[PDB]
Amino acid sequence: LQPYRQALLDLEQEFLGDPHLSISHVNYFLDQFQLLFPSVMVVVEQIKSQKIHGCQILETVYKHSCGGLPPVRSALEKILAVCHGVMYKQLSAWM
């Protein structure tokens, strides 16, 4: 959500810069997140509903990480990388 927040701040600055800009410019600029966010929201709702716990959550994310949306794929890759970093920390402690 940090990149989304950054995009929102940039949009706010741009709209402050030009009083002739319309909401259509925001709708264009924000459409990438308008496509990205719904899939992640569905994934989060699924995670909540299935009560995925511990590393079993990681397996579900991996299954979801295999999605077809390239931007969703990249986002899930970032999330998976973070989860794998945590897993690797635990694995380091064990090993």
Added chain:
Amino acid sequence: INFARMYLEQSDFHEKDVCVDRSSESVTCQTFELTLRSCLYPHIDKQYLD
């Protein structure tokens, strides 16, 4: 010496941290208990032994 202290040493009195940030090597930073055991507890055990 007296005048130095009252005027010159008074004038020249321009006599105006444990970085416990895990961010650098968090992966390499020991656990709080492990860090304690390795930095404090070994020293405490040494002093106790002595």
